[PDB]
Amino acid sequence: IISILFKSIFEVAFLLIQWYIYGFSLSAVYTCKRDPCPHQVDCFLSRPTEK
Amino acid sequence: IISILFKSIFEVAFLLIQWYIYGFSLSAVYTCKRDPCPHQVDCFLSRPTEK
Ligand SMILES: CCCCCCCCCCCCCC
Ligand SMILES: CCCCCCCCCCCCCC
Ligand SMILES: CCCCCCCCCCCCCC
Ligand SMILES: CCCCCCCCCCCCCC
Numbered sequence: 001i002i003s004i005l006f007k008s009i010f011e012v013a014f015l016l017i018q019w020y021i022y023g024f025s026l027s028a029v030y031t032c033k034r035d036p037c038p039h040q041v042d043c044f045l046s047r048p049t050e051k
Numbered sequence: 052i053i054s055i056l057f058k059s060i061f062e063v064a065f066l067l068i069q070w071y072i073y074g075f076s077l078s079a080v081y082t083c084k085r086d087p088c089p090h091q092v093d094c095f096l097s098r099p100t101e102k
Contacts, residue, residue, distance in 0.1 A: 040090040 026051055
């Protein structure tokens with residue numbers, strides 16, 4: 001019983017972390033506002049739809 | 052008298068236009084926010100102090 005409970009708990013925790021961090025989709029264009037980049041810049045990903 | 056007056060008027064008008072448009076100094080770094088430039092970009096001039 002403990003093993004099954006821990007399996008379920010880990011699954012739920014990983015799902016929640018993924019939802020909080022990334023979500024469940026990816027966009028083609030990303031906006032970056034981190035140094036040393038001046039102001040904001042546009043970056044492009046690879047294979048967003050397939051991922 | 053008319054010639055002198057028009058000379059003075061032209062001088063004053065040109066000074067006012069210059070003040071309104073540029074001012075009386077130039078900076079080394081300029082910020083550009085015009086299409087097709089994405090977001091804002093930084094540009095650098097030539098010989099600002101001498102000018
Ligand atoms: C089962 C794995 C548990 C991992 C816990 C670590 C939490 C990750 C950090 C939470 C976000 C922090 C944002 C500053
Ligand atoms: C069992 C439920 C499966 C449906 C999950 C749908 C998640 C939302 C996906 C939205 C994608 C939007 C693409 C632009
Ligand atoms: C003696 C020369 C007179 C020139 C008059 C032209 C004025 C220039 C335009 C004024 C600024 C317009 C901002 C939209
Ligand atoms: C007869 C008056 C002459 C003085 C004109 C000064 C104009 C202001 C210039 C400011 C330059 C600042 C450099 C950073």
